[PDB]
């Protein structure tokens, strides 16, 4: 019946000192999944090597005693590609929530249960192998997400233990794509997003608002802007309708209690609790789950635009805490999955998949030949050269590409360019050719005089990266020998319209800018 | 054929002149093909024999019944369609290991794609051409090792997947997949890299490792390193996808001619594009040739027959107002006469014309006058200071067939 | 069908350069089973820690290409306690064979098959655990055991790979005892011993002789003497009778061939092949197995004494090798198991188990009290103090104790001492007490005047060591307060006769001296 037994599922470890004066976005520490998996023992490390490529279902465990009097909540975030500290320097918060993120409140029934279980594959979409590549790197960031905590008696040590289930060897690197071009929504889309700590203090605080219903386009979070997988996936149509399922979790210590009502809203203050009580509502007393229906003056809410519906949190029974207690009532709202409605909404531009990529003006042709050559790669990215004035566009394609780790598939670059001079004086020629390795014979091509528009099928790189197409095995590069005296001739030389023939996207992530 | 290798005659090869040549064989000697066998020493550290030994080779046939076709079943069709196992039938030059520290032998595999340079020449072989279509590959290779070295010298080595420079630790080599070989033997290894797949055209994206395990032990009287010949055989594809080379559509640049030199008088240049795919080059322009999987498979194969569309495109110089001239494209047959099909173009500066590869299907000098296709290019225009880059030729393989597994060394 | 696969059974590794001019006893290198098991990967190392105590069935593999022209043979020896280099310095050989030892000849069908498989438990008798104790340490010594090899072209690298089968956790440290006091022989006793390289050269070499039939007592091997488990176990009776099973193995390169006859002998040269052919014989042509019957002028052979029977190896057809070949014919004989006969043989001294331990004379009592106190421990060992002149005895008990790793059980120290002076002037007293921790109250005791002989049951230490009884938990220590004016009184004070009540022995080993 021996209880002290070894733990074979353990994968690695990490420990960090939580300061007693820890404040909001403070970075407690990171956890390099790779390094730990190998810095720690050989059971899973040897198996890491032997199996080669696997699809690990990790379950991290943050051991932190369940103290109900320290109003603290430590959040965890999973970043396999896109999140630098130096810019958000040290701290972080809603821009952090833009990835993967389980917020772990202490009082919350647990002295270890602080654990997250995810499948590095369901979230990364590409399995994982021993040999460290450069396109992706699995690191976990732990940070304080609470605001009104108690100053602890001393900086308490905290240990995180990881556990794996390597699973069998996978024969593919890229697993099933996390999305295909025509964004096809089902019966429930996972708008997996946490919302920064809301607060209610005894001193009059009115109408909390998770200004929902603008989950569509990119957002600006003080320190940065953000496009996350969810936002990109929901940015395709002008408005949405349906029901959101989410949950509330009180952060605050047991000395402070309160209660609030959740209700659909749109304008400024439903002054009357009599208005709040008349219609739909849910009086919450702290933690709990809620599935609410979207409601506006015309039923649906906007996607890109704000002020077209909202989720209301009217404080009901004011925060009652002994005088000795300082600090507001604090709770973290978590949006989960939304079941679509049934009423239709128009797409963003038109129905046809055709999106403006970039448009280059002011080409600077070499001093001598007066010829400019542009090379459009093979990975969709923020194109920008130094021999022209590149103006970049934005559309759901550009977002989903930037809010996703990998993308592979075929597109047609719909080129179009114009000459300056009066019809008679116009002169020159342009030449488009799909090339492979740096200026040699590998290719397919054609020339154009006063045929000033072209389209050429070309396909996104070796397996499918987002930028610096991993190897020289980065095809596509179409040169743009504007053989013409480019100069005072190309009004706005090529405009590039990429038409997604059918791409595939891998990895749920964001891009903060 | 290694000697020590169990045999005093068994040195024998059995092949079907048809499975490899793809065209049967007949008594009357033609000129497009000639079956000759070259025998050569492929070993390096042999022993100086007591005298120049005589060696006899005896051939044996099984003529079989009379075949009614010359060209048998094609060895390939245009869209390169790979199955469950492709035969990358290739031997690898004698690898050596000598007692004096030699580390990490490497059959830099995983760059079976494009043309290679072997000191004396470059080479495009049927295999390379067939695998050059996509940016990278993934799967499992089956091959074999064969010790050349005399019984006085013995050694042992480990085979393991690698990618970088030296897996210093036998502990690294032992931790992961490996196969300790003691000389001869067969091995089927899985390709392994930092992102699973290996490149086709590009090198340094995966490799086959041969780490010497137990150093070469040979009496002092023995001089000469340990030597073995590795032989790559067939590869079973994986399942993960890889992008094609340029795009999906079959359209490949053939040549692009600049600086046309029109006759002194009429100032007209006429180019004649044959009917056999080949390295086009004339002397009345500056021909710049391209390279793509189509060009490779054509050059690494003996015969090719089928239809393609020459996608022509040409441009004039002068400002829009001063530009003048005309071009005329016509599919002809025998040398400048009436046999044909044709059309004229002013400021319609692009054309496409279905035309088909010669009598039965040769690679060059289309065997007879029965070499159709020849499209003349009467650039009736003052070609001179007018044709920027006159025609560019884009051949789009409608569906060709290829016969004969061969190479072309250059 | 992938052939390149990982090897989970691998435990650790080792590599050593074999010199081209390597000669006989040269120490190629060692292999610390513990250190390697952990210096190498974590699969079996973590399992080492988690299981705690296990009973590993190791199988070592010496990869060395099968070269048939280098007349080399590399031997391996297993020492869990008793074998220091410095005294045998560098080299080693028959004293080495005194442990465990698989001699590995090269020409001998194998380029890897050079592998040994043993159970660290069947040979050590005590399981093995992660935490390194000090009484035992598993290290393997590899050495050249051949003499007439060829000078290789260069110092060839050689790699040894070990493989385990940890097995389940064992609940005991000490497993089943490898022997109990009354040495009880069965139907086949394993006199597992290799015999130094015998040689036959074309130049007249007559009657090779594995002077068998003196497997009994300790032997002197040039550099040292030796008592091995076998010798001790067979040293109990004056002579033996039965049949030996063994094998021969040619070391020599294929350039040199020969043939010899095996036959029972006793005297000097059976000059006649006609004598050798008349009686029993076995014409061998190199390698092979042989089971021979012991034969002498009175059937049986001696155990302690030599020249009472012998195994004959008469060269039959002289060594035929090309002139270019230098070097004699060389073969290693290996004695294996002996099936006892049926005719009886007398024990060594008498039937009763009573063996003299030590006898101390010239006691040097302290200057003042003139009292000497001797403390006989609890582990059987070469007793020796500095307050007397200790004279140690030798008998099968002393041998089996010294040729074995662990021993635990109870014995009665049969003490006896004598006074000097004429009966009337004799004076004094002695006091014997079985004590525990260093001079305190823990014990059991009695006093003696002219009662000059005693016997006291006392038992061999915590679990059962051979010397420096691992801890303070080393009971037994009987003090010998010869309260008497020890001086000119104790003729030969105590004599110590240990009578094995029933001891148990663990671990097959030797002790070289």
Dihedral sign, Cα of residue B22, residue B28, residue B31, residue B36: positive
How is C380-410 classified by DSSP, letter by letter?
------SSSEEEE---HHHHHHHTEEEEEEE
Flag whether residue B132 sits within 8 Å of chain A, measured between CB atoms: no
Q: In this structure, are C291 and C356 located in the same domain?
A: no
Longest C-alpha distance within chain A, in Å?
Answer: 97
Q: Are A30 and A140 within 8 A, CB to CB?
A: yes
Longest CA pairwise span in chain C (Å): 97
Best CA proximity match to C295, nearest among C249, C239, C237, C234: C239
How open is the CA angle B319-B323-B329, to the nearest 5 degrees?
135
B123 vs chain C: nearest CA distance in angstroms? 30
Q: Which residues on B lie below 8 Å from C15 (Cβ)?
A: 170
First vs last C-alpha separation in chain B: 27
Q: CA dist C345 to B309, C35, C237, C302, C502, Å? A: 106, 47, 6, 10, 23
Residue B93 burial (10 A CB sphere; 0-12, 13-18, 19+): exposed
Beta carbons of A46 and C50 less than 8 Å apart: no
> Which residue, of B245, B276, B307, is where some domain finishes?
B245
**Cβ–Cβ gap A132/B252 under 8 Å:** no
CA distance B118 to chain C (A): 29
- The residue to which tokens 């005047």 are assigned: C449
d(CA C282, CA B159) in angstroms, rounded, equals 46
Give the span between the Cα atoms of A157 and A154, in whole angstroms. Answer: 9
Long-range pairs for A367-370 at CB < 8 Å and ≥24 separation? Answer: A370/A484, A370/A485, A370/A486, A370/A487
Looking at the structure, do residues B111 and B257 belong to the same domain, yes or no? Answer: no
C184: CB partners within 8 A, 6+ apart: none
Question: Which among B266, B317, B292, B267 is positioned nearest to B393, based on CA atoms?
Answer: B292
Residue A110 in contact with partner chain C when CB distance is under 8 A? no
- By C-alpha distance, the chain C residue nearest A44 is C43
Q: In what order do the strands lie in the sheet with A219-220?
A: A219-220, A225-228, A510-512
Nearest to C13 among B151, B170, B220 (CB): B170
Q: How many angstroms separate the CA atoms of A194 and A197, rounded?
A: 9
Of B163, B253, B320, the CB nearest to A445: B253
Q: Say yes or no for a CB contact (<8 Å) between C3 and B154.
A: no
CA distance C264 to C282: 10
What angle is formed at CA B244 by the lines to CA B243 and CA B246, rounded to 5 degrees? 115
CA dihedral A165, A166, A167, A172 (to 10 degrees): 140
- What is the spatial distance between Cα C221 and Cα C243, in angstroms, rounded to a whole number? 25
C321 inside 8 A of chain B by CB: no
Strand partners, B258: B286, B389
Facing B313 at nearest CB: one of A408, A441, A447: A447
Alpha helices in A120-238 (DSSP H): 229-234
- Residue C397 belongs to domain spanning: 349-513
Tokens 């099984």 -> residue: B62
How many domains does the structure of chain A reveal? Answer: 2
Same domain, residue pair B279 and B167: no
> Per-residue DSSP letters for A11-37?
EEEEEEEEPTT--TT-EEEEEEHHHHH
A280: contact with C, CB 8 A cutoff: no
In Å, how far is C169's CA from the nearest CA of chain A? Answer: 12
CA C125 to chain A, closest CA, distance in angstroms equals 26
Could you tell me how many residues make up chain C? 513
Kindly report the number of other CB atoms within 10 A of residue B123's CB atom: 15
Are the C-beta atoms of residues B200 and B131 closer than 8 Å to each other?
yes
**Strand ranges (E), B19-107:** 76-77, 86-97, 105-107
Indicate whether B93 and B214 sit together in one domain.
yes
What tokens were used for A69?
A: 């009097």
- Tell me the chain C residues in contact with residue B223 when contact means C-beta distances shorter than 8 Å: 153
Nearest-angstrom CA–CA distance, C473 and A484: 99
From residue C302, how far is each of C228, C234, C345 by CA, in Å? 17, 10, 10
Rounded Cα–Cα distance for residues C256 and C69 (Å) = 10
Q: How far is CA C214 from CA A47, B359, C343, in A?
A: 54, 96, 18
* Residues C337 and C366 placed together within one structural domain of the fold: no
Contacts 24+ apart (CB under 8 A), A82-85: A82/A509, A82/A510, A82/A511, A82/A512, A83/A141, A83/A510, A83/A512, A85/A27
Q: A493 in helix, strand or coil?
A: strand
A30/chain B closest Cα distance in angstroms: 23
Distance from CA of A456 to the nearest CA of B (A): 9
Which residues, at least 6 apart from A304, have a Cβ–Cβ distance to it below 8 Å? A214, A216, A217, A235, A238
Does the CB of C169 have a partner CB in chain A at under 8 Å?
Answer: no
Phi, psi at C420, each rounded to 5°: -85, -75
Closest CA to A356 of A496, A457, A183: A496
**Pairs from A339-342 (Cβ < 8 Å, separation ≥ 24):** A339/A187, A339/A188, A339/A242, A339/A243, A339/A245, A340/A185, A340/A187, A340/A188, A340/A189, A340/A240, A340/A241, A340/A242, A341/A240, A341/A241, A341/A242, A341/A243, A341/A294, A341/A300, A342/A241
Taking the C-alpha atoms of residue C405 and residue C402, their distance in angstroms, rounded to an integer, is 8
| Chain A residues with CB-CB distance to C45 below 8 A | 41-42
Best to test chain C binding among A4, A8, A13, A42 (most C CBs inside 10 Å): A42
Rounded distance between C-alpha atoms, residue B320 and residue B340, angstroms: 33
Q: For residues A343 and A355, state if they share a domain.
A: no
Question: What is the DSSP annotation of B114-144?
Answer: S-EE-SS-EEEEHHHHHHTTBSEE-EEEEEE
Tell me the C-alpha to C-alpha distance, in Å, between residue C400 and each of B85, C242, C512. Answer: 66, 22, 13
Nearest residue to C80 via CA among C382, C513, C511: C511
CA–CA separation, C215 and C223 (whole Å) = 19
Are A107 and A198 in a shared domain? yes
Give the residue from C23, C18, C197, C191 showing the smallest Cα distance to C94.
C197
Three-state SS string over C444-505 comes to: EEEEECCCCEEEEEECCCCCCCCCCCCCCCCCCCEEEEECCCCCCCECEEEEEEEEEEEEEE
Last residue of a domain, one of A319, A348, A377: A348
Residues A494 and A353 in one domain: yes
What are the DSSP calls for C93-116, one per residue?
Answer: -HHHHTS---EEESSSS-SS--EE
Residue A79 φ then ψ, to 5°: -125, 110
First-to-last CA distance in chain C? Answer: 56
Q: How far is CA C406 from CA A100, C31, C403, C461, C470, in A?
A: 60, 23, 10, 10, 11
* Resolution, Å (one decimal): 3.5
Q: Which two tokens stand for residue A341?
A: 């409605």
- Quote the tokens at residue A225: 């802007």
Read off the CATH number of the domain in which A295 is found.
Answer: 2.60.120.20
The answer on B222 and B96 residing in a single domain is: yes
Provide the token pair at B41.
């020493």
Alpha-carbon span A508 to A405, nearest angstrom: 7
Closest-CA residue of C relative to A38 is C42
Taking CA–CA distances from C5, the nearest residue in chain A reads A50
B117 part of contact set with chain A, CB < 8 Å: no
B213 touches chain C (CB under 8 A): yes
CA distance A187 to B45: 71
Cα separation, A87 vs C152, whole angstroms: 65
Q: Contact, A504 vs A444, CB < 8 A?
A: no
Chain C nearest C-alpha distance from B223 (Å): 8
Q: Which candidate, B81, B195, B204, places its Cα nearest to that of A463?
A: B195
- End of a domain among B245, B279, B295? B245
C73 and C190 together in one domain? yes
Nearest C-alpha in A relative to C44: A43
**B87 and chain A in contact, CB less than 8 A:** no
Whether C297 and C195 map to the same domain: the answer is yes
- Whole-number Å distance between alpha carbons of B267 and C152: 80
Do residue B316 and residue A449 have CB atoms under 8 angstroms apart? yes
Contact C322/A at CB under 8 A: no
Distance in angstroms (rounded) separating the CA atoms of residues A487 and C90: 85
Q: Which two tokens stand for residue B53?
A: 């030994």
For chain B, the helix, strand and coil percentages under 3-state DSSP, each to the nearest 5: 5, 40, 60
Residues of chain A with Cβ-Cβ distance to B190 below 8 Å are 52
Contact at CB, A440 and B251, closer than 8 angstroms: no
What whole-number distance in Å separates Cα of residue C487 and Cα of residue B303?
117
At residue C201, what are phi and psi to the nearest 5 degrees? -120, 145
Listed in sequence order, the DSSP H helices in A123-235 are 229-234
Do residues A111 and A202 both lie within one domain? yes
Query: Which of A401, A406, A306, A405 has the alpha carbon at shortest distance from A355?
Result: A401
Q: Sort C266 into a burial class: Cβ within 10 Å, 0-12 / 13-18 / 19+.
A: middle
Torsion angle defined by CA atoms of residues C275, C278, C282 and C284, in that order, rounded to the nearest 10 degrees: 60
Residue B205: phi and psi, rounded to 5, are -130, 65
What are the distances in angstroms from CA A140 to CA A160, A195, C364?
11, 19, 75
Closest alpha carbon within chain B to A436: B246
Nearest CA in chain A to C41: A42
Q: How many CB atoms lie within 10 A of CB A369?
A: 12
Residues 6+ apart with CB under 8 A from C292: C243, C244, C246, C262, C264, C280, C282, C311
Cα C286 from chain centroid?
Answer: 29
CA of C167 to nearest chain A CA: how many angstroms apart?
16
Q: Could you say which DSSP state residue C217 is in? A: S
**What pairs with residue C265 in β-bridges?**
C310
CB spacing of B321 vs A424 below 8 angstroms: yes
Grouping H, G, I as helix, E, B as strand and the rest as coil, residue A368 is coil
Residues in chain B with CB shorter than 8 Å from the CB of A49 are 172, 175-176
DSSP 8-state assignment for residue A388? S
- Which tokens hold the place of C159? 């790699």
């Amino acid at each position: 019946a021996v209880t002290v037994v070894p733990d074979p599922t353990c994968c690695g470890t990490l420990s960090f000192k939580v300061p007693k004066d820890a404040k909001k976005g403070k970075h407690l520490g990171t956890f390099d999944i790779r390094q730990a998996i190998m810095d720690y023992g050989g059971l899973h490390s040897q198996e890491w090597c032997a199996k080669g490529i696997v699809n690990p279902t990790f379950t991290v465990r943050m051991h932190a005693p369940r103290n109900a009097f320290a109003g603290l909540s430590i959040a965890c975030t999973f970043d396999d590609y896109k999140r630098i500290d130096l810019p958000a320097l040290g701290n972080e918060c809603p821009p952090s929530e833009m990835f993967e993120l389980p917020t772990k409140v202490f009082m919350l029934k647990d002295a270890d249960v602080h654990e997250w279980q995810f499948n590095y594959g369901e979230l990364t979409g590409h399995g994982l192998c021993n040999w460290a590549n450069v396109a992706t790197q699995p690191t976990l960031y732990f940070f304080v997400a609470s605001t009104n905590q108690v100053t602890m008696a001393a900086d308490w040590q905290c240990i995180v233990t990881m556990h794996v289930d390597m699973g069998p060897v996978i024969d593919r690197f890229e697993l099933n794509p996390t999305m295909t071009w025509p964004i096809q929504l089902g019966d429930t889309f996972a708008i997996d997003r946490y919302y920064e700590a809301k607060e209610i203090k005894l001193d009059g605080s009115t109408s909390m608002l998770s200004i929902s219903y603008n989950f569509g386009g990119p957002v600006k979070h003080s320190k940065k802007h953000a496009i996350s997988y969810s936002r990109a996936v929901m940015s395709r149509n002008l408005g949405w309708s349906g029901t959101i399922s989410g949950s509330v979790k009180s952060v605050s210590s047991l000395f402070c209690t309160a209660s609030f009502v959740i209700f659909p809203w749109e304008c400024e203050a439903p002054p009357t609790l009599r208005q709040v009580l008349w219609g739909p509502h849910q009086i919450m007393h702290g933690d709990g789950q809620f599935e609410i229906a979207i409601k506006t003056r015309l039923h649906s809410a906007a996607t890109t635009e704000e002020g077209f519906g909202r989720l209301g949190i009217l404080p009901l029974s004011g925060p009652i805490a002994p005088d000795a207690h300082v600090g507001s009532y604090e709770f973290i709202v978590h949006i989960n999955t939304w079941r679509p409605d049934s009423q239709v909404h128009p797409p963003m531009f038109s129905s046809s998949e055709l999106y403006n990529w970039f448009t280059l003006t002011n080409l600077k042709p070499d001093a001598n030949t007066g010829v400019v050559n542009f090379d459009i790669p093979g990975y969709i990215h923020d194109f920008a050269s130094k021999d022209a004035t590149v103006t970049l566009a934005s559309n759901p394609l550009s977002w989903l590409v930037a809010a996703t780790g990998w993308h592979y598939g075929e597109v047609d670059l719909c080129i179009s360019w114009s000459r300056s001079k009066q019809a008679q004086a116009q002169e020159g020629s342009v030449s488009i050719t799909t090339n492979y390795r740096d200026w040699g014979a590998y290719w397919q091509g054609q020339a154009r005089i006063y045929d000033l528009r072209r389209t050429e099928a070309e396909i996104p790189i070796f397996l499918g990266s987002y930028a610096g197409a991993t190897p020289s095995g980065a095809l596509g590069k179409q040169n743009y020998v504007r053989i013409s005296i480019v100069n005072a001739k190309d009004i706005v030389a090529l405009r590039v319209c990429l038409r997604p023939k059918s791409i595939k996207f891998w990895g749920r992530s964001a891009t903060l800018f």
